[PDB]
Structure formats: structure tokens, C-alpha cells
Design a protein around this ligand. Sequence first.
Ligand SMILES: [Zn+2]
Ligand SMILES: [Zn+2]
Ligand SMILES: [Zn+2]
Ligand SMILES: [Zn+2]
Ligand SMILES: [Zn+2]
Ligand SMILES: [Zn+2]
Ligand SMILES: [Zn+2]
Ligand SMILES: [Zn+2]
Lengths: 89, 90, 451, 89, 76
Amino acid sequence: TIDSISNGILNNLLTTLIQDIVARETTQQQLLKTRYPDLRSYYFDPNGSLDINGLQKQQESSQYIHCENCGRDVSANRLAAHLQRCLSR
Amino acid sequence: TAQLKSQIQQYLVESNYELISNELKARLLQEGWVDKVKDLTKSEMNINESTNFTQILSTVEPKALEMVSDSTRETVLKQIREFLEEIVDT
Amino acid sequence: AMSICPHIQQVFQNEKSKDGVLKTCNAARYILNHSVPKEKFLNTMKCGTCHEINSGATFMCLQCGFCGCWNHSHFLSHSKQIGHIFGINSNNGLLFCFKCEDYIGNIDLINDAILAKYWDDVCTKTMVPSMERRDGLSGLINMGSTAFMSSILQCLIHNPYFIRHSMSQIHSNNCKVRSPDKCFSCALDKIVHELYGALNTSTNRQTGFIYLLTCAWKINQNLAGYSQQDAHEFWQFIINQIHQSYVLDLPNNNKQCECIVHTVFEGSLESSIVCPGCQNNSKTTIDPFLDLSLDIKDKKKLYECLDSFHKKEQLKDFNYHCGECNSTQDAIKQLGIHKLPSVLVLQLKRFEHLLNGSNRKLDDFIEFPTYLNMKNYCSTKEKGKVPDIIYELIGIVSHKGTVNEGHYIAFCKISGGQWFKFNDSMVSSISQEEVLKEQAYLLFYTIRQVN
Amino acid sequence: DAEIKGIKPKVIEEYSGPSNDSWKSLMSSAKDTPLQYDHMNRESLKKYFNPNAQLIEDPLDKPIQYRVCEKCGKPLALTAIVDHLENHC
Amino acid sequence: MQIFVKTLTGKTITLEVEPSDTIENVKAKIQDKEGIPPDQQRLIFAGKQLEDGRTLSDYNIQKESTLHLVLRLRGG
Ligand SMILES: [Zn+2]
Ligand SMILES: [Zn+2]
Ligand SMILES: [Zn+2]
Ligand SMILES: [Zn+2]
Ligand SMILES: [Zn+2]
Ligand SMILES: [Zn+2]
Ligand SMILES: [Zn+2]
Ligand SMILES: [Zn+2]
């Protein structure tokens, strides 16, 4: 019947799309797991505190950067000021 | 005979299939069903600790079929049916 | 201990059989990239047995010309009856083994089969991405007032057109200056290098960003990160500089620029001028655009803002005399889309000016959709209606603070559908629903479906 | 909802067992045919989009596909690896 | 010639200008209409911010073209 053929058409469309999507998902995850045997998911923190490696925000100004210009090491959160004083040659 | 069905389908292809497929895709995409199915897939992959396609599909397909909104379902069916009453004799 | 299909290993034990296979895969994929929709329906989605179209997935046989459906087990029947255990899914080109009952997705050679001829060399010179770098995820520390820059850069860092450009070595291949302390693109390629690969051979992965900052200081110190600035202005400035670098690397009546910016971001508005009497006309002006700026007052949704944007206006300060109705008139102006860009960038005008000369931030939440339909905004009808035109949200920049002082943050979506928040050095997982609850300032949309 | 009797004579009139045809028959056509996109209609793209727009269909399907040079460490798109190896590494 | 400017609210205003007119002059006219100083103004055309010292003709800006006006949102 018309009703039946229409149901079959819709089923055809849905099963085609589903099989495509699922095949793509399974192939991608298979690839990721095979390439990277020790694979870990990026961390999700419900508390909104930890990064994708499950770490908190690092202490600045505890970190420093070595400015290749002039040969001076400069605390990173003060780097721009240095460049304003350094690039002004 | 049942060659008839295939014949009719051939006609359907030569003529509108794109409009249906695209409208379906847009509807399922816009209502969030596609991403729900992605989340379901990640969840099942994590629960069964497996990427084997057959076993994951075996659990995914029925539910995914149920998740199709009634609105989209009846609208797309309605549209196909609209297209069918054109080219069949009763 | 995940296994690999032993059947393809078996075939691959013989070099010529392997070559036949890879040749056929390459040929098939070329066909898939070069076949019109109807031919595809009739010749790759038609079951060889029942002759139905789209009887579930249809598979094209690796060993013969037969196509077979899923619903009636007809490829399954080809496999049982002829002994051909490998078939290709006509929706994605992926190769199925009917003995394993699983797809082969984890063989690098198969995924990149077009390089099979040179595969040995490919394996000697290069390695797969490191787990840490594979998604290019790393934070960029605040080096002064650089939040307006990095927030912009992460959406660029996750843009497929840009990543395709950069990883293709186009600037590197063609740069006439070939120094990252002068060339913005060389520096960018260095950034991509630092984030996805490894410099030869803790302070990690900051070199490219520092080069970019040095270039910026050299062209405009004010926009170089010491002081707070406008992210949209930085966007237009940097894309213009990139465009200038494209023009620079050229060896050579062409009004439209042919650069990467103008093949991705450039659209055109149609402005019509019509007589309110005759309502026929019209005087049409075409304006290029790289992004859209939207008013938000008294509105709650992005579609409302676009509607307002697209809304007709009557000019009261334009001198206009109609020749068709022979009278002085106040012309009607309307903006619509003449041409859409591949990537659509939106700025919400989250500010207002007061009579006392001060400004105020608008913190009003504006709802924005995960998927955006532009059909109501296209100027030109076909022999009519305009078809569906849908974009996918891929990026958000948000601001916290006031008009004259604040902070930018970025949100980016990656594969599998997961969202991450990029706050300087901190990359974190975030759900889609919360991103969607954010106060959006900038939005990045990639073209997804065009009917 | 009602019963189908046959196929209208005019469609057969002007349009029209196991098939003998072969999918590799498309190669001839495929050799002469420009790159095609799925669910982005070409004519609508011509009317509403620019003629030289770059286009990537479904850009977030899988993570970026690339490899890294052992000598200079550059991340290379698959279509760029070979010449990078010829005169750029 | 007449050109247009689309303000923050979306309201469009009209200016009478010559191709040789400087960005400073246009911004002055905008100040004269809206009461907003030039240093607070950002004038956008064709994906570029219009720069002081340059002319309309330098940017190939013609009759009845529309410029888009915005402000700055600073963040550091
Ligand atoms: Zn220094
Ligand atoms: Zn069948
Ligand atoms: Zn076969
Ligand atoms: Zn197998
Ligand atoms: Zn360079
Ligand atoms: Zn260009
Ligand atoms: Zn009139
Ligand atoms: Zn290299």
C-alpha cells in the first residue's frame, strides 16, 4: 500500500543515515584507540576548575620567559612592557 | 510483480529526492537529534569499552529510531505521501 | 588488545594484490568526488538484486561491479555466494570486512591510500601526531593585555580552512621573505608547528605567538598587546594584513581579491532602493562584507537581531526624486544577502552611547542557535522562493567587564561534538548547554547545508 | 491509503533481472567531472555564493589529519607532505 | 555625492561628501550629527577600518555606498 511504501521509504532514509553516522563514529574511535593505546579522555570538571589535563590554573607571576631579544629573562605577565622597552631600538 | 516498486523508485530518482533528504537532514539536525545520537554513541562506546561496529549498531539503531520526533516523522511522511499521489494509479 | 582484520593483512602479504586494492580504492574515491547526485543514486545506491534505491546502505563490491543492499542481505549474499568479503559503503568510501563484522578504520595506510605509492617514504620521514598535540590543544599565557588577541586566535586555530592553508605549507612554499619575525603567516605556521607537532627537538609552545607579537609591535604597538583594544578591530586588521601578505607573495582588472580571506569570508549585500508608490524599480548596490554587526536592544534572540538588521528602513535625510511616479520621495532602503561567505562571523553591538557622551555596556542575553538558517535574508528569488541555507556554530568569543575595560574568553567545538573553553593558559571541557547560556559577543559559523 | 494498480503509461512513455552494468563505467565520466559536493546544491551555490569560494563539507567530522616531519618537525596536511619533502624540509 | 552610515541602533544617516574628502571630515560630520567624538568613532567599509589622513577615493568608496559605524570594546 501507499502507506506501506511510504513507511518503507522513510525507513530506508533513516537506516541509511544512521548506518553512515554510526560507521563514521566507530571508525573514528577505533582509529583513536588503536593509534593511542594509552588514550585518556580530556578531563571534564563539573566544578569548572580543572583543565583538559585535569590541572588548575598555573601560578603567574611564578613562571618566566627567556626573551631572545637583548638576552634578558622576563616574567611572562610583564613581557609586553619589556618589549615596549626593548623593541624601542 | 514486485519489480514495480523498483521501477517507481527509479522514477523517483530521475525526478525531488534531494529536497526530501535535505529537509529531513535539516529537521533532525536543528532539533538536536543528531548530536543526541552522537552523545549516545560516545556513551555506548565508553560503557562497552568497544569500537566494534556491529555490536554497537545492534544497540544504537532501535533507540535512535524511537528518538525521531513525532513532528519531523509525520511531516516527512506527509511530504513523501504528497509526492506519491502524483504518479500512482488507484 | 584491539586486533586488526587478518584478511586484509593476508591480501597485503602480496604486493600486487595490495596495489590492485589501493588502486581501486583511490579510483572509487575519485569517482565519489566526481559524480553527480542522480548517477550516484542510480549506480551506487541501487541494489543489484532487488533494484531498490537506498535499501539501507548500498555496498559497491571491491572485487566486482555488483552493488548490494543491507535490508535484503544482498551484499551479504554476494559475499556468501561469490566469496568477496570486502565491500565499500557508498556513503563514506569506507571498507568493510564481512568476516570481522567491523569496519577498518584504524589502518593509517587505508585512510591515506592515495599516498600508497610513496607510503614507505611517508613512514620514514614523518610520524603520527603526538597524543598531547594531536588536537593542537594548549593554552596561551597572558603576556600583558593579550586577551583580545588569543580569544580571536583560538577560533582561527580551530578553523579547517585556515588549518588546511597552514598545514599545506602555502606561505612556507611561496614566501619570498621566509622570516616569521617579519611574516605573519610564517609565524602562524610556527604556531601550528608548536601546537600540533614538535620543535626540534617549564616553558613550552610559546615561540610563534611571540613572533606574532613582535610583528604586531612593529606595525602598530598600540595593537600589540600592551593596551586593551577591540577584538573586531583586531580581526579586521589581522585579516587585512594576512591578505596583504598573500598579495605580497604573488608574482603579479581584478577588483575582487583572490586571497584566502576573500574566498572564505567575503560575501555581498544587496541594497535596493525602491519607490514607495511604484514599488517596482530598483536601484541596486552591491557591497562586500567580511562580517556582520547586529543591533541587540529590546531583543532576546539572534534571529530577532538579524530580522532587525534585515528590516527595511525609510531614509529621512536622503534627497530623492522618483522618475517613475514623477515626485519627490523618501526612499526605502533594505539590506539583504547577495552572496554568503563560507565562514560567517558575527559581532553583537553590545554597547550604547548616552547624551552625556559616556557609553554603557549592554549585558542583555541574546539567544543564539546551534544551527542558523539564512533563507529569509537572501535578496534574490529563483524562478519564487529562496532555499534553506544553514550554518553550524563552531566558535564564540565572550566579554566580561565594561565598555572601556574588560576580558575576552573563547569557546571552541571539536570533533565528536565536544566543547572546550579557552581562557588564556587554561583549556577546559565544557558542555554545549552552558556555552549556549553564555553572553555571546562574537560568533563563528561554518557553512553546513545549502539547498 | 488506497490500492495501487499500475505505473502511469506516460512516465514509461517518455522516461523508462540482475544488472550487467559496472560502477567502473563511471570512470569515463569521472575523469571529466569537477569536484562535487553532497548537500550543497551547485546551482544555488552559483546564485547565492561566490564562484571561487573555498568549501569544506562537514569540517568537524574527525580531528585534523596530518603528520609531523622527523627532521624539521612541521605538521603537514596529507596533500602537502610530498613537496615539503622535495624542497621545503 | 550622498553616502550613508549605519549607526549602532541600525539607523542609517546620510552625508553629502566628495571622493577626496578625508576620513577626519566624515567623522567630523558624524560628530556633528550624533555628538560623538571622532576618537570614539570606528568607521567600517569592506572589512576595513577607515584611517585618518586617507581619502574616500583611496578606498574606492562611491556614491550611495554604506559605511558601518561601531565603537570599541576594550579587553586585556
Ligand atoms: Zn627583550
Ligand atoms: Zn535488496
Ligand atoms: Zn564481487
Ligand atoms: Zn576480517
Ligand atoms: Zn613568511
Ligand atoms: Zn582576497
Ligand atoms: Zn512612485
Ligand atoms: Zn619537514
